[PDB]
Amino acid sequence: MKSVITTVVSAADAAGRFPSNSDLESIQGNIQRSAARLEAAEKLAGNHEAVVKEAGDACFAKYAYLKNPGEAGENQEKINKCYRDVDHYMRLVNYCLVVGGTGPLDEWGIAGAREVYRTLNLPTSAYVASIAYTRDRLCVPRDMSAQAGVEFSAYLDYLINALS
Amino acid sequence: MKSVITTVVSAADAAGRFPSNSDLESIQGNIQRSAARLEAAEKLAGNHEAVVKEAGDACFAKYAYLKNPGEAGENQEKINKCYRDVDHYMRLVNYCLVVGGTGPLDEWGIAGAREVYRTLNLPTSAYVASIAYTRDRLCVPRDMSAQAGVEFSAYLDYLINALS
Amino acid sequence: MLDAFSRVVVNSDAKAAYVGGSDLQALKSFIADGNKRLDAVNSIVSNASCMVSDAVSGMICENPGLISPGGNCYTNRRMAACLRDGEIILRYVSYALLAGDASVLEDRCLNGLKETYIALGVPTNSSIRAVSIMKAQAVAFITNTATERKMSFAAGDCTSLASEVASYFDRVGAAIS
Amino acid sequence: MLDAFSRVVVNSDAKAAYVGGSDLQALKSFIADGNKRLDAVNSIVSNASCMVSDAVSGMICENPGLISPGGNCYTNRRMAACLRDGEIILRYVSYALLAGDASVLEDRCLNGLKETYIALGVPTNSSIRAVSIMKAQAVAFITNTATERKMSFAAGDCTSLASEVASYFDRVGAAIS
Amino acid sequence: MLDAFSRVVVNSDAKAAYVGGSDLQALKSFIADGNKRLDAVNSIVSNASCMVSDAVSGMICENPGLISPGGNCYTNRRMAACLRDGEIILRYVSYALLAGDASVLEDRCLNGLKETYIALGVPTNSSIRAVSIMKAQAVAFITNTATERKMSFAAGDCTSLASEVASYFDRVGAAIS
Amino acid sequence: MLDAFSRVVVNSDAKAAYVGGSDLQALKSFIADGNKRLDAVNSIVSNASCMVSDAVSGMICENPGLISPGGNCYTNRRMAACLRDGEIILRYVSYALLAGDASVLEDRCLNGLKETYIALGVPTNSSIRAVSIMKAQAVAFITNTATERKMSFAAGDCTSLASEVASYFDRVGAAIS
Amino acid sequence: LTLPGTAETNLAVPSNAVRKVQPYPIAKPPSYSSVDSLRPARVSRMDADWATIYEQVRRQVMGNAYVMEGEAPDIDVAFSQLKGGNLTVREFVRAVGKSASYRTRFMEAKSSYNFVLLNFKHFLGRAPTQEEVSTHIQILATSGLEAEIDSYIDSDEYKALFGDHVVPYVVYRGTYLSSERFNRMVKANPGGATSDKAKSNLNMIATVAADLPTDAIDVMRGLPSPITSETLAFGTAYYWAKVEKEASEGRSASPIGEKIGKFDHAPISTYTSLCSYDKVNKAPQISVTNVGSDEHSYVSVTSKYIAPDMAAAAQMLADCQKYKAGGNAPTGKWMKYYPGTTVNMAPYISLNDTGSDSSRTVSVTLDKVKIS
Ligand SMILES: C=CC1=C(C)[C@@H](Cc2[nH]c(/C=C3N=C(/C=C4\NC(=O)[C@H](C)[C@H]4CC)C(C)=C\3CCC(=O)O)c(CCC(=O)O)c2C)NC1=O
Ligand SMILES: C=CC1=C(C)[C@@H](Cc2[nH]c(/C=C3N=C(/C=C4\NC(=O)[C@H](C)[C@H]4CC)C(C)=C\3CCC(=O)O)c(CCC(=O)O)c2C)NC1=O
Ligand SMILES: C=CC1=C(C)[C@@H](Cc2[nH]c(/C=C3N=C(/C=C4\NC(=O)[C@H](C)[C@H]4CC)C(C)=C\3CCC(=O)O)c(CCC(=O)O)c2C)NC1=O
Ligand SMILES: C=CC1=C(C)[C@@H](Cc2[nH]c(/C=C3N=C(/C=C4\NC(=O)[C@H](C)[C@H]4CC)C(C)=C\3CCC(=O)O)c(CCC(=O)O)c2C)NC1=O
Ligand SMILES: C=CC1=C(C)[C@@H](Cc2[nH]c(/C=C3N=C(/C=C4\NC(=O)[C@H](C)[C@H]4CC)C(C)=C\3CCC(=O)O)c(CCC(=O)O)c2C)NC1=O
Ligand SMILES: C=CC1=C(C)[C@@H](Cc2[nH]c(/C=C3N=C(/C=C4\NC(=O)[C@H](C)[C@H]4CC)C(C)=C\3CCC(=O)O)c(CCC(=O)O)c2C)NC1=O
Ligand SMILES: C=CC1=C(C)[C@@H](Cc2[nH]c(/C=C3N=C(/C=C4\NC(=O)[C@H](C)[C@H]4CC)C(C)=C\3CCC(=O)O)c(CCC(=O)O)c2C)NC1=O
Ligand SMILES: C=CC1=C(C)[C@@H](Cc2[nH]c(/C=C3N=C(/C=C4\NC(=O)[C@H](C)[C@H]4CC)C(C)=C\3CCC(=O)O)c(CCC(=O)O)c2C)NC1=O
Ligand SMILES: C=CC1=C(C)[C@@H](Cc2[nH]c(/C=C3N=C(/C=C4\NC(=O)[C@H](C)[C@H]4CC)C(C)=C\3CCC(=O)O)c(CCC(=O)O)c2C)NC1=O
Ligand SMILES: C=CC1=C(C)[C@@H](Cc2[nH]c(/C=C3N=C(/C=C4\NC(=O)[C@H](C)[C@H]4CC)C(C)=C\3CCC(=O)O)c(CCC(=O)O)c2C)NC1=O
Ligand SMILES: C=CC1=C(C)[C@@H](Cc2[nH]c(/C=C3N=C(/C=C4\NC(=O)[C@H](C)[C@H]4CC)C(C)=C\3CCC(=O)O)c(CCC(=O)O)c2C)NC1=O
Ligand SMILES: C=CC1=C(C)[C@@H](Cc2[nH]c(/C=C3N=C(/C=C4\NC(=O)[C@H](C)[C@H]4CC)C(C)=C\3CCC(=O)O)c(CCC(=O)O)c2C)NC1=O
Ligand SMILES: C=CC1=C(C)[C@@H](Cc2[nH]c(/C=C3N=C(/C=C4\NC(=O)[C@H](C)[C@H]4CC)C(C)=C\3CCC(=O)O)c(CCC(=O)O)c2C)NC1=O
Ligand SMILES: C=CC1=C(C)[C@@H](Cc2[nH]c(/C=C3N=C(/C=C4\NC(=O)[C@H](C)[C@H]4CC)C(C)=C\3CCC(=O)O)c(CCC(=O)O)c2C)NC1=O
């Protein structure tokens, strides 16, 4: 969806013209950038079960209230719904590292979050605590390259900034 | 004008949003392309009086009928008007080699060409005889680098396709 | 809409699957002909005005039944429409050569092109002959076998993109047949 | 458009009849439960946000094919639409309960709902389940048989209005089937 | 891979049939003279729209009573049907040049076509002259001895393919008469 | 088969027939030296379009009165009709070469040619001069002694068929003497 | 953003630099118009509050967009100036249309022809003719998006119907410039619970507004007409014609069959040897490329291709009016049915075995690239 290609192709079509030499110049950056973010994708896809397990419970460690009855986490299965609720978010930032833009995150995870998390009483401050626990746990020598840790963190705080 | 920066900063503004990771990535292409085209601008600015003297006369070598009386070339001074009337185009190819897009070529040279060249009886085929004579004389060992001559030819034929 | 990067996510969205190292190298292969694709679109829009004017007049010069009165390309307005009508096809195939897949022109240009040309009364067999000239010259430029215009390039193979644009131009022809 | 007082005038416009004392007492009975209808509309819009959010999640919790990818309530935007799509159904049956006849929703809500959901790909059997939860809950409020929320009323009969709103919730179901 | 081509042409459950890169030389090793036989069909189907518009107009300019009142190419319901029918013969004969067998041509195209044309009142005097132009039009394109268009090829002899379509057009002339 | 070839000619309607390869070897066994004779017809009719366009052009350069105004080849209605009689001599002598007889040449073509040329004002002394060029053209093609187009052949002698066609061409000229 | 009082921007006409803002909203059009008395009242800037001006701009200009709260901040930019009086509601829908939220659900997702028809539906509230399309499709070719939305808002048709203070709506004016232009407007504007987003092809007004005849179908106009103006005719009489249309208007059943493209085929008993009427007019759709070794050749079977009925009007009607002095001489009493026609040997080329010759008689006429 909203990639760097669909940015320049729709803008060249809304002007009603051919792909000019600015638009061919915009795709030349993607050779210099896909070598860093696509190995961040397979480091996410090869470790996606761990980063939902030991980081999804850190919201419950910070917010230990919501396992009380009458509230948003009642029984064991809604916690299993909650680890399903955050696995789609880690799928989508994997889905935006492979695109290069912020395209698959907006209409699939972001657009409509102010509606469904208000009616179903889901606290967005407990969402962003689990995501920012993943954000500050990046480092150069263990996780990925020194350059991929910039852009993997640059998609996560956009999820923080759009949910808050 | 229509640069690679002002394409992606107006499309971010017409959406009404921040510069995302798709918009930051498009400027990373300018690190890899400004070494190629800014050398071509210094080859054009250091040789601009040569490429209108022994290339502006080649339209008159192709069209000797224009110097007939009652035509668009009457006296000595309209030919001296004409070499100024071609040097403004070669200033504009220089004005878009340093931008990166077709920004200053459009509203300063193209937008309105179908009006003033039809009403004042100027043949646009004798424009593009002079411009495409400069196009086929590019080569790698004498003129510039191998990559600058691709892009300098890529702005000349855009002027051919606009006037024809 | 869907580029070559976002084509492999909507195949993976229906599986709810993370994109991993089994098909990322197929996508990393696409980036390896990045500059090979990039010069190819530049060679298309280089001679784009001379592309369509040789294509429509070649369709006229083999079938001179439209210039006859009562023909579709008879008057001076409809030839200005027809030079514009083949120019949009060149404009949107060049988007699909840049996006890497036939997804931008499919829902914008081809979606409803069939009954637009039927209701206005465009001879659909002559529209096949119109874009088949634009198919055979699009592979003539990006393999650089054009006789009257030769462009300098870095040497190598580019025939993988030649099957790409030739798979787009008969998708236009199948959408209008 | 048409309320309950204006429904009998177009029944009398087809006969060119002065509306008189043979059916004014059928309409005076409508004003006799004037306050009974008036408290009934207020109980629907009292817990109106908890009405639709329990109803669409009850449709989800019996059929998790929509949360599966490829389902019509998979992504986040479609759950935001489906929370709002069933809210408009509550917004117009609360109009028709106030107006006393199914005329205000039959042309503003039902006229055109079938082909919008067909061309979107909305599963019509699931929206049947979605509004029949709202049928079972709207009669649970105006009979004051809601287990988690009891409201105080003047005591009496209200089951004539219970079949009234239940007749409306099968009118939205018939136009989508 | 030709069994994949032979169904799809007898209209089984596939929509289309695509031949890859490695399969294309596997098809070329299967049939004999695989480089020339793909060049012969590429000469035919690039000029199919010009050939049937010339052969129908060649049929009219021999016998001009078809566009007289009482003819068969009067009332352009019929004239667009005859312009359709010339293309269907050309599209089936170009497959038979590609496959090398006339077996698809006899069972899909030609059985009962003598019975169809006597039931429709199609005159067999002019319908043979429609085919006999298209035999001479196809045999001039194959050896590149067309008057107007000279297409570029790798040089050599193609007269074994040129007498192949004259056998295939004679089976159309046998099954119509 | 030859009686079936007789059913092609005499039916007074357009008809067409071919012979398959199982039926072909019976035809080569029934006729004598038939691989020469099937090469004999194929030498002529592959160059028949230049043969009549040079012989009746050679009739004009020996007798320029036919392009005088009022002359019989002045208008293009008459000029195309002179080539139409030129080819129809050449097909009917080729089937007479193919069947090996002259009875189809007399009964289908030459019975009634003197009665229709005097009634049409056709110059019989000039058309004998036209067909004697076609006698002289065909003996160069049957002995491969044409100076422009020489054809490949399985070598040997075919001067018996050189005298066979010159016995067919003078039977045309004695019929219009 | 510009000024707290701004009647017109962009200086297109010269007389807008001196033009005031309208002090009051414009009146209704002065014809009779029997339909609009059943219609709801029009919403203006100076009668209604911002809760319902935003809803009716979403209900008409946005079609039925379902804009969320985080969706469309460009509209929230443009709405925040309209509440401050910084631009009129005429200029506000210019800012809505030029924004990307209008682009990313109507311009990129719909087709090129359908984008013009939705612009007449949203901005002017009607449906165009073919000449109105043909002047608007060149602005999408030469000038782009921003100049094409300027052709609606700076037109005189907008300023007479709505002016500077009235939200766009379906204006029933009774006496129209064409009888088509009433009922093509009505077909383009259905009532509630309809959007534009599912019909990525609209495909029905894209072929009624394409050719200037073939006005659209009556049940496609009795559907969105108002009430006590449709009833006693939509109980069960045209009601099944409405439901069978709605399953065709939904999912976009393409009207090659019944609307335009109107071919009397032969009955199925007439051929019966070229049988199986599913497979009756199918040809091999063959394509070759022949480039290197990634170069496919994809013989698809094509669909039932129809006689196009206009290429058979170019052919056989414009030309082939050969048609002259066909007396052809008439001596030939011996020709006996055919006269001019050669035996036509035509040897199928002797590839040394299993290849054979057949012959066929035909009438022969010399061509026009022949003698002299
Ligand atoms: C793709 C994202 C991604 C991650 C962030 C980690 C997340 C992560 N970190 C640790 C485990 C750890 N993580 C760190 C943190 C660091 N270690 C260092 O050498 C750096 C200084 C610093 C990088 C921020 C340390 C010190 C431990 C061991 C102690 C602990 O468990 O906290 C563990 C448990 C044991 C293990 O699996 O290694 C996990 C799942 N894994 C992932 O797949
Ligand atoms: C900014 C762009 C730019 C140019 C392209 C040249 C254009 C140019 N070339 C030549 C002059 C020439 N140009 C060429 C052409 C070539 N020479 C080679 O080594 C290559 C094989 C081939 C490149 C296509 C030759 C062979 C001459 C000398 C003969 C002649 O004058 O034509 C001249 C006249 C004399 C001179 O100054 O050299 C000019 C103005 N100058 C410029 O300022
Ligand atoms: C802004 C303008 C602009 C462009 C349009 C592109 C064009 C471009 N192409 C190549 C480089 C190349 N480009 C081609 C492509 C082709 N060669 C042919 O003979 C075919 C005709 C054609 C394929 C269709 C090939 C084969 C190479 C060398 C291999 C490669 O790098 O891909 C390179 C150098 C890459 C390198 O070697 O490191 C550049 C910079 N770049 C730009 O800066
Ligand atoms: C009866 C009139 C008549 C015409 C008008 C032309 C039109 C024409 N050109 C080409 C064929 C072509 N046309 C071009 C186009 C061009 N070549 C250039 O150098 C320019 C950049 C550009 C025209 C300005 C190219 C590159 C080819 C391929 C062959 C070639 O390289 O010349 C073809 C063949 C298409 C095909 O093979 O499918 C036709 C019909 N030919 C005709 O017979
Ligand atoms: C603006 C706020 C506002 C309202 C919402 C209505 C509500 C209202 N209801 C009743 C009065 C009543 N209301 C009900 C209705 C009900 N009782 C039940 O047990 C059912 C749950 C429910 C029907 C759905 C009944 C049964 C009476 C008593 C009989 C009657 O007066 O109708 C009365 C007093 C009339 C009287 O007794 O004289 C009023 C003022 N009026 C208002 O001013
Ligand atoms: C499987 C292979 C296949 C074919 C060969 C054609 C055969 C064919 N032709 C027609 C139908 C027709 N075919 C012709 C054709 C002609 N009349 C003439 O004078 C000319 C000689 C000739 C055109 C060159 C006409 C005129 C009709 C219409 C008959 C009528 O409407 O009166 C029909 C009837 C069905 C319909 O048209 O809807 C069929 C099956 N279609 C096929 O599917
Ligand atoms: C001043 C007095 C006078 C004349 C002498 C004639 C002269 C004459 N004869 C013919 C014209 C002709 N002349 C002949 C005659 C002959 N061609 C033959 O092959 C025969 C051997 C020979 C006669 C014996 C024929 C066949 C024509 C053409 C018929 C025609 O023009 O209608 C024409 C051409 C007329 C035209 O162009 O239509 C003229 C001027 N006319 C005159 O007004
Ligand atoms: C006044 C103008 C004028 C002409 C038009 C020609 C007409 C002409 N052609 C040939 C003679 C011929 N004409 C052809 C025919 C052809 N050769 C080919 O290779 C092609 C396939 C085909 C059309 C060009 C052949 C094969 C011969 C025999 C050549 C020979 O005699 O060696 C002859 C001699 C035969 C005879 O006299 O009976 C004459 C008069 N000569 C002229 O003086
Ligand atoms: C299916 C269609 C069909 C044909 C087109 C012919 C083609 C043909 N001709 C001959 C074969 C021949 N053709 C000729 C004839 C001639 N040779 C010359 O050099 C003279 C110019 C010319 C005299 C007219 C001769 C002399 C032979 C060899 C003897 C014979 O087989 O008759 C052969 C046998 C070649 C071999 O097997 O080696 C074939 C296939 N026969 C057919 O069945
Ligand atoms: C495109 C550029 C663009 C902008 C820069 C802003 C500018 C802007 N702000 C407001 C409108 C406003 N802006 C403010 C803001 C403030 N007042 C304070 O006391 C604080 C100092 C400050 C916030 C930090 C307030 C409070 C209003 C509403 C005024 C009111 O009605 O009370 C309005 C009028 C529209 C409206 O009222 O909603 C506009 C155009 N909007 C734009 O569209
Ligand atoms: C948004 C995407 C988009 C497209 C895909 C094209 C498609 C298209 N073509 C035409 C319209 C037309 N297109 C043609 C074209 C042709 N007729 C022929 O005989 C030739 C085969 C062929 C030229 C190659 C003609 C002649 C008309 C005008 C018909 C007329 O009014 O006479 C129209 C109607 C608008 C108009 O009439 O100007 C549209 C939408 N245009 C677009 O804007
Ligand atoms: C992907 C699709 C595809 C095709 C379209 C063909 C295209 C094709 N043809 C030939 C190659 C050839 N093509 C011809 C054909 C002809 N030459 C003539 O002079 C006649 C006019 C014409 C007869 C029809 C000949 C003679 C050769 C050389 C090989 C041979 O002699 O058989 C070659 C190999 C060499 C070359 O590149 O030219 C290819 C790739 N093959 C394919 O794979
Ligand atoms: C069955 C076998 C068969 C034939 C042999 C021909 C015989 C023949 N020729 C013509 C008809 C004709 N034939 C000629 C021919 C000639 N005049 C000359 O000056 C030259 C000597 C010679 C050409 C070389 C001309 C010019 C006409 C037309 C006469 C006219 O239009 O008035 C006609 C009248 C019918 C018509 O053409 O409309 C017939 C039956 N046709 C046949 O179907
Ligand atoms: C009075 C009515 C009348 C006509 C309508 C034409 C019709 C016509 N065309 C051709 C003959 C032909 N027609 C074509 C077809 C084409 N040629 C091209 O260059 C295009 C690409 C393509 C569409 C026009 C070809 C290739 C030939 C054979 C060689 C040639 O004549 O060009 C033939 C000869 C067939 C034969 O000899 O059996 C005829 C009769 N001629 C007539 O006499």
GROMACS .gro file of N, CA and C in nm, chain A residues 134-150 152:
model
   54
  134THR      N    1   0.959  -0.371   2.386
  134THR     CA    2   1.036  -0.421   2.274
  134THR      C    3   1.125  -0.315   2.213
  135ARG      N    4   1.092  -0.186   2.230
  135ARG     CA    5   1.166  -0.081   2.160
  135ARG      C    6   1.301  -0.053   2.225
  136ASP      N    7   1.307  -0.045   2.357
  136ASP     CA    8   1.432  -0.015   2.425
  136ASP      C    9   1.521  -0.137   2.443
  137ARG      N   10   1.475  -0.256   2.404
  137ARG     CA   11   1.554  -0.377   2.416
  137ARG      C   12   1.635  -0.407   2.291
  138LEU      N   13   1.649  -0.311   2.200
  138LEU     CA   14   1.737  -0.331   2.086
  138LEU      C   15   1.880  -0.295   2.122
  139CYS      N   16   1.973  -0.367   2.061
  139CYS     CA   17   2.115  -0.337   2.073
  139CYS      C   18   2.186  -0.387   1.948
  140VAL      N   19   2.301  -0.327   1.921
  140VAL     CA   20   2.386  -0.361   1.807
  140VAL      C   21   2.442  -0.504   1.812
  141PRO      N   22   2.520  -0.551   1.916
  141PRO     CA   23   2.599  -0.674   1.893
  141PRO      C   24   2.521  -0.805   1.898
  142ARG      N   25   2.403  -0.805   1.960
  142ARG     CA   26   2.329  -0.930   1.972
  142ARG      C   27   2.224  -0.944   1.862
  143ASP      N   28   2.140  -0.842   1.844
  143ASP     CA   29   2.014  -0.860   1.772
  143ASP      C   30   2.032  -0.862   1.621
  144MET      N   31   2.081  -0.752   1.565
  144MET     CA   32   2.082  -0.735   1.421
  144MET      C   33   2.203  -0.650   1.384
  145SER      N   34   2.200  -0.590   1.266
  145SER     CA   35   2.303  -0.495   1.229
  145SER      C   36   2.285  -0.364   1.306
  146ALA      N   37   2.388  -0.280   1.299
  146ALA     CA   38   2.380  -0.150   1.364
  146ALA      C   39   2.289  -0.054   1.289
  147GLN      N   40   2.266  -0.079   1.160
  147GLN     CA   41   2.178   0.005   1.081
  147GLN      C   42   2.033  -0.042   1.083
  148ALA      N   43   2.010  -0.173   1.091
  148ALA     CA   44   1.874  -0.225   1.095
  148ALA      C   45   1.806  -0.196   1.227
  149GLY      N   46   1.883  -0.176   1.334
  149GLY     CA   47   1.826  -0.138   1.462
  149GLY      C   48   1.773   0.003   1.466
  150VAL      N   49   1.814   0.088   1.372
  150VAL     CA   50   1.755   0.221   1.361
  150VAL      C   51   1.614   0.211   1.304
  152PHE      N   52   1.415  -0.060   1.249
  152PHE     CA   53   1.321  -0.145   1.321
  152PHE      C   54   1.264  -0.071   1.441
   0.00000   0.00000   0.00000
